[PDB]
């Protein structure tokens, strides 16, 4: 098609949008997260800080149920006592920063639940192969 | 067996060989890719450059259909308009640098096709698990 336009859907462009809008574009935001006489030491410190953060996040994901995937389902049920808001209003209406400031108290508990469920899945997978 | 020789199949040793020859030895070439008062700053800059490149390649692989594997099939059909050369002549005759200089124009399009196919596979896997 001659006469072809383009919108350059850039890095960090679904902030105010709903969850299901940002779920499509999150991959490019994950992609742009990485690359980017004393001034070289400062830029070096900033660069190795950036890779310290990226490696921390990759390790923190890796002990959970997914190694390098970006979408990950697990076997831990959502405790309703945390936020008690149903599917449509959190998937269509609510933004991301609002969702961050809504459950910024039970985050570590969710981390521990994921880790415990993945470790018991590891031992169950190791014992499923025990009889074989 | 007494009297046992050895050829030390070292790093970067299948350059002029065919694709199927280098496909066996690629694992050691991937293994050797990583390790390796102002001179410490230069060597430090070179070392963190090397890990910047390695982490860029690991992230670029990870958003595709494989996380840490070295051989990877996907669900994107090979567009024949790119190179229109059949299986035997590209798997038995052609070298690697020739193969680089043959399709060094459609590489980014291949990257985008892989990323789009993997992301729609992500949403299809998430929706296959929706009804369960």
């Amino acid at each position, epitope marked *: *098609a*001659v*006469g*072809i*336009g*383009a919108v*350059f859907l*850039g890095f960090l462009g679904a902030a105010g949008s709903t969850m299901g809008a940002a779920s499509m574009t999150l991959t490019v935001q994950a992609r742009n997260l990485l690359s980017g006489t004393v001034w070289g030491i400062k830029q070096l410190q900033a660069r190795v800080l950036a890779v310290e953060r990226y490696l921390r996040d990759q390790q923190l994901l890796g002990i959970w149920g997914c190694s390098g995937k970006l979408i990950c389902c697990t076997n831990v049920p959502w405790n309703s006592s945390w936020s008690n808001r149903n599917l449509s209003e959190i998937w269509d209406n609510m933004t991301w920063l609002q969702w961050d400031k809504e459950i910024s108290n039970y985050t570590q508990i969710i981390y521990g639940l994921l880790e415990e469920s993945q470790n018991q899945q590891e031992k169950n997978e190791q014992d499923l192969l025990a009889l074989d | 067996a007494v009297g046992i020789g050895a050829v030390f199949l070292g790093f970067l040793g299948a350059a002029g060989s065919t694709m199927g020859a280098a496909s066996m030895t690629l694992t050691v070439q991937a293994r050797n890719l990583l390790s390796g008062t102002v001179w410490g700053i230069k060597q430090l800059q070179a070392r963190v450059l090397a890990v910047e490149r390695y982490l860029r390649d690991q992230q670029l692989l990870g958003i595709w259909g494989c996380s840490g594997k070295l051989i990877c099939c996907t669900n994107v059909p090979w567009n024949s308009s790119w190179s229109n050369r059949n299986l035997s002549e590209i798997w038995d005759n052609m070298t690697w640098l020739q193969w680089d200089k043959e399709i060094s124009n459609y590489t980014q399009i291949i990257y985008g096709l892989l990323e789009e196919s993997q992301n729609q596979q992500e949403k299809n896997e998430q929706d296959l698990l929706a009804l369960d």
Partner: antibody, heavy 127, light 105 residues
Framework: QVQLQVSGPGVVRPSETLSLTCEVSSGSTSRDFFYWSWVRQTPGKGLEWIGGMYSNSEETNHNPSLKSRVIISKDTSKNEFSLRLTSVTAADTAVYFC???????????????????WGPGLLVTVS | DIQMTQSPSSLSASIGDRVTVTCRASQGIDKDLSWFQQKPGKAPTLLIYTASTLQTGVSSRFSGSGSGTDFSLTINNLQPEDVATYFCQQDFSFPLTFGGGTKVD
């Protein structure tokens, strides 16, 4: 007004200059570019594209069936897409739409989707 | 210019019929055909871009087939919101030529 809302005079005197404006907007990026286009809907014929121009450049691409009688201009600072059709006869009595022409691509390689939505038109009568 | 002929001008069907709009071209526009829905009095809104890809927002009822010069829009389970004039748009070469218009009653 809504996006791609065409406003201006609804009655053009015979053989004078029709001049219509349209509420356009910039993209989400400074790197973005639109093609704004004038299209007419006639009762006699179907939808007829009048012309248009890139938001990046100042070159005008138009339909030569109107025989280069258009002056297609824009002002991104003032949200203005403007048609100055000259020598307007009663054949140009039509409902004019102004259209945004762009693609929705997601990541820097591929195409991912094209959006060519139109805004509600303005009937211009020539008598 | 490239002539675009859309057929029919009007087609009548009951609630739930799979109808078909045929758009033919004079020249090779191979997959540069758009399908638009226009309420009477309102602006045309997009249904199909690149003649086979469903646009996000409209339902899966609007499907598209065909290639080259000949394309066919297909409406499975015809709805009361489908009362609209449909237009097939060529965007292969200058100028932009559009369809004749297909009314649903």
């Amino acid at each position: 007004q809504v996006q791609l809302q065409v406003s201006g005079p609804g009655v053009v005197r015979p053989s004078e200059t029709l001049s219509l404006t349209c509420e356009v907007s910039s993209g989400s990026t400074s790197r973005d570019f639109f093609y704004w286009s004038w299209v007419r809907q006639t009762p006699g014929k179907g939808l007829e594209w009048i012309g248009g121009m890139y938001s990046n450049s100042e070159e005008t691409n138009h339909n030569p069936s109107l025989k280069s009688r258009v002056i297609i201009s824009k002002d991104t600072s003032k949200n203005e897409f403007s048609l100055r059709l000259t020598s307007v006869t009663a054949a140009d009595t039509a409902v004019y739409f102004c259209s945004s022409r762009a693609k929705i691509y997601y990541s820097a390689s591929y195409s991912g989707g094209r959006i060519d939505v139109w805004g509600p038109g303005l009937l211009v009568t020539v008598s | 210019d490239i002539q675009m002929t859309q057929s029919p001008s009007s087609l009548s069907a009951s609630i739930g019929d799979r109808v078909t709009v045929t758009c033919r071209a004079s020249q090779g526009i191979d997959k540069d055909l758009s399908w638009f829905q226009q309420k009477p009095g309102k602006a045309p809104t997009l249904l199909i871009y690149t003649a086979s890809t469903l646009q996000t927002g409209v339902s899966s009822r609007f499907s598209g087939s065909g290639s080259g010069t000949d394309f066919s829009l297909t409406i499975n389970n015809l709805q009361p919101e489908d009362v609209a004039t449909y237009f097939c748009q060529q965007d292969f070469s200058f100028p932009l030529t559009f369809g004749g218009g297909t009314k649903v009653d």
